[PDB]
Amino acid sequence: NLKIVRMDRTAGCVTGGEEIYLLCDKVQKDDIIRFYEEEENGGVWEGFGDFSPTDVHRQFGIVFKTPKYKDVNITKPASVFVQLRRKSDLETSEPKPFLYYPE
Amino acid sequence: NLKIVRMDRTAGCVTGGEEIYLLCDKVQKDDIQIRFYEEEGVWEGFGDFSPTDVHRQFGIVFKTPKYKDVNITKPASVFVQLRRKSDLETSEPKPFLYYPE
């Protein structure tokens, strides 16, 4: 169902606000980007891509800005995951890798 | 009919070979081209991509062509248009900046 096909960037500054173009299989502009890192003995950090319905290009693309990472003071890169997700039923795509690098 | 809606980069090195994501209205993967051009005589360069880089008829991921002169000292502004191979129809242009190496 949900699939990320490709992204123009797979790395970003921990400060977020960087624009990325994502090409996906069919989505609905008002019912659709979850950055997440599975944390060590249970928890899960998440941040969401920033964009509006008009940024969803013809159901097959999304232009958005990255969320800020959980810790903007890291000195070494942090490898996290990115996935599509639907608001209506919280179903998701298989995750893609994303690399947060220090400021 | 043809329309460039947006591109993730509107500038690049004269050397070419830089990847760009272009979002467009409906195209046919086997009947589409991306033409960079400059009136002089007319210089043209074509986005480098395969039919499989045309994403669901609504986007094209490609690599920029090398500009005509790699030794420019100041940026050269050109146009980019989508163009159908069959009937040569084109979109409205967008500006694109080639900067010095």
Cβ contact (<8 Å) for B56 and A57? no
- In 3D space, the residue among A26, A20, A80, A9 whose CA is nearest the CA of residue A55 turns out to be A20
Cβ contact (<8 Å) for B8 and A8? yes
Q: Is the sign of the CA dihedral B59, B60, B61, B63 positive or negative?
A: negative
Asked if the C-beta of A11 comes within 8 angstroms of chain B's C-beta atoms, the answer is no
Asked if A19 and B8 touch (Cβ cutoff 8 Å), the reply is yes
Picking from A3, A21, A25, A63 by the largest number of B CB atoms within 10 A of its own CB, the best residue to mutate is: A21
**C-alpha to C-alpha distance for A29 and A61, rounded to whole angstroms:** 10
- Domains of chain A (ranges plus CATH)? 1-103 (2.60.40.10)
Structure tokens, B19 = 């990847």
Mapping DSSP onto H, E and C, the string for B50-75 reads CHHHECCCCEEEEECCCCCCCCCCCC
Secondary element (H or E) of residue A20: strand A19-24
- How was this model experimentally determined? X-ray
Structure tokens, B52 = 């499989």
**C-alpha to C-alpha distance for B20 and B64, rounded to whole angstroms:** 7
**C-alpha to C-alpha distance for A21 and A9, rounded to whole angstroms:** 8
**C-alpha to C-alpha distance for B3 and B27, rounded to whole angstroms:** 9
Picking from B10, B23, B53 by the largest number of A CB atoms within 10 A of its own CB, the best residue to mutate is: B23
Cβ contact (<8 Å) for A61 and B19? no
CA distance to partner chain B, nearest, from residue A81 (Å): 21
Residues of chain B contacting residue A8, judged by C-beta atoms under 8 Å apart = 8, 19, 21, 61
Work out the number of other CB atoms within 10 angstroms of the CB of residue B13.
15
Question: Quick one: residue B16, left, alpha or beta (phi over 0 = left, psi -120 to 50 = alpha)?
Answer: left
**C-alpha to C-alpha distance for B37 and B15, rounded to whole angstroms:** 15
Across-strand partners of B79? B37, B95
**C-alpha to C-alpha distance for A83 and B36, rounded to whole angstroms:** 34
- In 3D space, the residue among A82, A6, A83, A86 whose CA is nearest the CA of residue B56 turns out to be A6
